[PDB]
Amino acid sequence: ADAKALDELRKPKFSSKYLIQHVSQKLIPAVK
Amino acid sequence: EWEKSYQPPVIHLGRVLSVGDGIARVYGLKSVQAGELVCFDSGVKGMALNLQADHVGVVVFGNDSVIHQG
Amino acid sequence: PAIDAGYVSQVIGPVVDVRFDGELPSILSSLEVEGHSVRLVLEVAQHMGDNTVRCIAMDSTDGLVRGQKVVDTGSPIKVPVGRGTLGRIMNVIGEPVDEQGPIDAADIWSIHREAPEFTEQSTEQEILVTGIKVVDLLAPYQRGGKIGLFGGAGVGKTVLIMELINNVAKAHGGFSVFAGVGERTREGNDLYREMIESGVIKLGAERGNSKCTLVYGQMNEPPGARARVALTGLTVAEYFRDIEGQDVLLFVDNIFRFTQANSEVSALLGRIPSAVGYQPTLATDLGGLQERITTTTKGSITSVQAVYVPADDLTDPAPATTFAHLDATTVLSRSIAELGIYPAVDPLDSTSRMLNPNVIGAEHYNVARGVQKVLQDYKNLQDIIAILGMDELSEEDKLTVARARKIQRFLSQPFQVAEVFTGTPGKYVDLADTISGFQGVLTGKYDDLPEMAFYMVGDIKEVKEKADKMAKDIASRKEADNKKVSEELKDIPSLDKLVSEIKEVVIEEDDGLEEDFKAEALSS
Amino acid sequence: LKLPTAPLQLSGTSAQIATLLWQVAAKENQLDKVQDELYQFIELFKQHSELRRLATDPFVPTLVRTKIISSVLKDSGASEITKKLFEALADEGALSALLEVTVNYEELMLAHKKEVYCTVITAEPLDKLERVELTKKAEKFVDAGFKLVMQEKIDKKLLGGFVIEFSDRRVDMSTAKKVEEFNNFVNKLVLSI
Ligand SMILES: Nc1ncnc2c1ncn2[C@@H]1O[C@H](COP(=O)(O)OP(=O)(O)O)[C@@H](O)[C@H]1O
Ligand SMILES: [Mg+2]
């Protein structure tokens, strides 16, 4: 993997959020 | 006749990954031949020695001080 | 063309990784690179593990791109074998390199096979008379056995192997195979040209009466070709042994260059190196090759192979491994050659399994062991002679110093292939002439002869002729030398007559290099 | 077994994951579905420090790492592929390989959308005709009927014309290279005559 293809992943590219929001009621109860 | 037969050829690029101990490692250059003479942007020539899956080992015909990563 | 065709993954010198999308080729199978400057043949060495095979190229990899399609031939390297390959020169992959057309294929055999089994081995020891005094006496060659000629960097193991070609092969009857492995191309062009003068190789229409196949993998070739041309040379010789069923001679010049070529490839095949820098699989690479060169019950291969020693070291692992595989060993020394003794055979390092009193006879064996005892006793005296001198030994010691200095010179011999740079004519010494010739020196029949009468002669009659000639040349002396050179009536012209006979050459106006460069290029 | 062949072949062990991730998602026709879920996970590693602790910290046990990832993906409507993917990387501790898996997943999608990203640097902003004219000659440079997207840049050091930057090759068909390719040609020839 190169760097110019990997440095453009710091910008958000998801444009859909059925996972990024569907863990708040799942992540912090699981790590606790 | 030079201008009626004139196409500026497509220049294949490659980044330097790593340089030092006399050999640069070069990202890219996908169609480079084994043993090909490559030219760095500092003017210094090199020879495409080891074609690898992910880089090209280039031995540098000159001082490796003028080559940087990138 | 999707499947059964892979593409180049990576090129590391002569080692190419090829990636196949399905049904990888077998190990030792040969692949073909599409669209190269020459025919580039790879041979699969390893299965690397992610649908990648690792191959060794039989030609140069300069000009290879990491996408080039590689097709599988579904078989190993297969060379033409038969009587249609006699008189031809082949390379590692079986192509003709003598410009005499395509090679007539009695069969197309793979260069890789297993060694013949234990039940097919032969146990038969008959002597091979060579005409060389030091070989027939102290380490006689077996007719049907493996012979090795050890020595390094100009001791004469190619001049010795040409003499065995001259002496043994012309009076042999069967076919020869010469496998040039990693040697000079000048030296292989010399052999091809003198085998046409000798009628061993006949060209054109009478080609089937040729009695030698040449297979050349010389020292300009990349290490993939040199690591495999000794196997092409056997496959020609194994065909005449197994199928034609006859006695053949296999001369392999520098079978060390098979070992060295595998050691260049193995640095790039990703291996931990062995002792002094060689590949870990040295003994089995060499052993898997040498075990094919045998006499079986169906045919015989009398192999003579030169073995280079690196930096004149016999404990180096590539010479030391080759010693076990040979029936007769002929170690050539540099310290003997600098004395002018040629062939420079170390008589206290050359061994044969034929030096056995049940095999060569009782009196041949006793002369041979008697000569080695005089030479060993003189070797034990070398340090005290060096610092104290000749005048301090016993009379019993300085009797054997003078006898061993006589048999040291008498083991030397003019070769018929050395006449071109020495001038002395060669001498084929018969086996009976060297046993009774060396039997006389041990008893003391020739203590009164000088030492230099033994140097560069054929047999014991010629030390008596050379001593008479040596004594006479310090006796023949003439008064006023019989010139008759001045006052020669009408033969010697003047200078200005002779200068006028010189056809004066013309000078073509200062090198002319522009008209014959600008004629053809128009590009830079 | 019988997987669809990948659009272009790639590097080792992080592109091999994404090539297998691509071939599974093409056998199941979820090539944009799991691509977006990959992008959703990159942002999800950015929001939380307790989620990148399961990818960098060497003291998080293997049992804690494989139970937590399965716990937050037992629900949430993710693919069957990416649920099996993330428990595979969490068993082996290769969750940090996700960020390099997905950039090899991108260029597999790019060579399947039939697409090439480029950068055209010109002297002045283009016309409704200059844009169609160089695009008609830029099909000669891509090795297919690929869809060059665009990108428009401006520099006045070029004397009209354009250059292309294809991210691995460039074509300098500007006039400013044409005048020094003229001058070094005419100076090369008059020292020959
Ligand atoms: N029998 C011999 N008589 C005279 N000179 C020899 C003899 N054998 C070798 N030499 C000398 O040694 C040199 C090198 O021999 P060569 O056969 O080339 O050895 P190698 O193949 O080991 O390099 C020859 O050029 C020759 O001058
Ligand atoms: Mg030699």
How many Å apart are CA D19 and CA D111, to the nearest integer?
12
How many Å apart are CA B54 and CA C214, to the nearest integer?
43
Please report whether residue B4 resides in a domain.
Answer: no
Please report whether residue C493 resides in a domain.
Answer: no
- On whether both C143 and C270 belong to a single domain, the answer is yes
Best to test chain D binding among A4, A14, A17 (most D CBs inside 10 Å): A14
How many Å apart are CA C225 and CA C212, to the nearest integer?
21
Query: Do B56 and B39 contact (CB within 8 A), yes or no?
Result: no
- Mention every residue, 6+ apart, whose C-beta is less than 8 A from residue C499: none
Q: How many CB atoms lie within 10 A of CB C447?
A: 11
Please report whether residue C503 resides in a domain.
Answer: no
Calculate the alpha carbon distances from C149 to C21, C164, D183 in Å: 48, 11, 66
How many Å apart are CA C331 and CA C348, to the nearest integer?
9
Task: Give the sheet arrangement for strand D169-171, strand by strand.
Answer: B11-12, D169-171, D162-165, D120-122, D152-154
How many Å apart are CA D142 and CA D134, to the nearest integer?
13
Spot the catalytic one: C69, C83, C113, C184. Answer: C184
Which member of C2, C7, C50 has the closest CB to residue D16?
C50
- Mention every residue, 6+ apart, whose C-beta is less than 8 A from residue C125: C142, C145, C353, C354, C356, C359
Interchain contact, C64 vs B34, CB within 8 Å:
yes
Q: Which residues of A touch D44 (CB under 8 A)?
A: 19-20, 23
DSSP state for residue C166 in the 8-state scheme:
I
How far from chain centre, in Å, is Cα D28? 22
- On whether both C123 and C261 belong to a single domain, the answer is yes
Q: What is the CATH number of the domain that holds B35?
A: 2.40.30.20
Token pair 């400013």 is at which residue? D176
Q: What is the CATH number of the domain that holds C57?
A: 2.40.10.170
Ligand 1 pocket test, candidate residues C159, C167, C251, most atoms within 8 A of CB: C159
CA dihedral D56, D62, D67, D69 (to 10 degrees): 30
Each residue of C48-63: b (16+ CB within 10 Å) or e?
A: beebbbbbbbbbbbeb
DSSP letters for C67-111: T-EEEEEEEE-EEEESGGGTT-EE-TTS-B-SSS-PPP-SEEEES
Residue A28, SS3?
Answer: helix
Question: Which domain-ending residue is among C294, C321, C354?
Answer: C354
Angle between helices D15-27 and D33-47 (to 10 degrees): 130
Closest by Cα among C214, C212, C200 to C97: C214
How many Å apart are CA C79 and CA C91, to the nearest integer?
9
- In chain A, the N- to C-terminal Cα span, in Å, equals 35
* C300 beta partners: C247
- Mention every residue, 6+ apart, whose C-beta is less than 8 A from residue C55: C15, C16, C17, C18, C31, C42, C43, C44, C45
Q: What is the CATH number of the domain that holds C176?
A: 3.40.50.300
- On whether both C284 and C414 belong to a single domain, the answer is no
Query: Do C340 and C333 contact (CB within 8 A), yes or no?
Result: no
Query: Do C21 and C3 contact (CB within 8 A), yes or no?
Result: yes
How many Å apart are CA C113 and CA C350, to the nearest integer?
31
Tell me whether residue A31 is exposed, middle or buried, using C-beta atoms within 10 angstroms of its C-beta: 0 to 12, 13 to 18, 19 or more: middle
Closest by Cα among D123, B53, D156 to C11: B53
Tally the domains of chain C. 3
C-alpha C505 to ligand 2 mean position (Å): 41
How many Å apart are CA D168 and CA D141, to the nearest integer?
12
- Give how far A7 is from chain D: nearest CA, Å: 10
Helix, strand, coil shares, percent, chain C, to 5: 35, 20, 45
User: Does a cis peptide bond (omega within 30 degrees of 0) precede residue C343?
Assistant: yes
C157 a known binding residue?
A: yes
State residue C170 phi and psi, 5-degree precision.
-75, -25
Question: Which domain-ending residue is among C437, C453, C476?
Answer: C476
Beta strands C89-90; C212-217: pairing state: parallel
**Residue D48 forms contact with A (CB below 8 Å):** yes
Q: Is C418 in the pocket of ligand 1 (CB under 6 A)?
A: yes
Calculate the alpha carbon distances from C488 to C5, C40, C326, C478, C484 in Å: 85, 71, 66, 22, 7
- Give how far C72 is from chain D: nearest CA, Å: 20
Query: Do C441 and C459 contact (CB within 8 A), yes or no?
Result: no
Residue C268, SS3?
Answer: helix
Query: Do D177 and B7 contact (CB within 8 A), yes or no?
Result: no
Q: Which residues of A touch D11 (CB under 8 A)?
A: 1
How many Å apart are CA A16 and CA D85, to the nearest integer?
20
Structural domain that includes position B51: 11-70
- Mention every residue, 6+ apart, whose C-beta is less than 8 A from residue D155: D121, D122, D123
* Ligand 1 atom 9: residue of nearest CA: C156
C370, two tokens? 């008697």
Which member of D168, D169, D173 has the closest CB to residue B8?
D173
Torsion sign, CA atoms C266, C269, C273, C279? negative
Please report whether residue C27 resides in a domain.
Answer: yes
- On whether both C180 and C109 belong to a single domain, the answer is yes
Q: Is C309 in the pocket of ligand 1 (CB under 6 A)?
A: no
- In chain C, the N- to C-terminal Cα span, in Å, equals 38
HSE value, Cβ hemisphere, 13 Å, CA-based, for C385: 14
DSSP state for residue C176 in the 8-state scheme:
E
Tally the domains of chain B. 1
Count of all residues that appear for chain D in the document: 193
Query: Do C268 and C209 contact (CB within 8 A), yes or no?
Result: no
* Helix or strand run (H / E) with residue C498: helix C495-500
Structural domain that includes position C63: 1-76
Query: Do D85 and D70 contact (CB within 8 A), yes or no?
Result: no
Please report whether residue C166 resides in a domain.
Answer: yes
- On whether both C264 and C276 belong to a single domain, the answer is yes
Closest by Cα among C81, C89, C85, C60 to C188: C89
Query: Do B11 and D167 contact (CB within 8 A), yes or no?
Result: no
How many Å apart are CA C132 and CA C140, to the nearest integer?
10
How many Å apart are CA C163 and CA C73, to the nearest integer?
41
Please report whether residue C499 resides in a domain.
Answer: no
How many Å apart are CA C346 and CA C412, to the nearest integer?
11
Please report whether residue B6 resides in a domain.
Answer: no
Query: Which conformational region is residue C284 in: left (phi greater than 0), alpha (psi within -120 to 50 degrees), or beta?
Result: alpha
Q: What is the CA radius of gyration of chain B?
A: 14
Please report whether residue B2 resides in a domain.
Answer: no
How many Å apart are CA D110 and CA D107, to the nearest integer?
5
Closest by Cα among C402, C411, C406 to C330: C411
Please report whether residue B66 resides in a domain.
Answer: yes
Token pair 């760097």 is at which residue? A3
- On whether both C177 and C286 belong to a single domain, the answer is yes
How far from chain centre, in Å, is Cα D61? 34
- On whether both C132 and C278 belong to a single domain, the answer is yes
Query: Do C87 and C212 contact (CB within 8 A), yes or no?
Result: yes
- Give how far A15 is from chain B: nearest CA, Å: 30
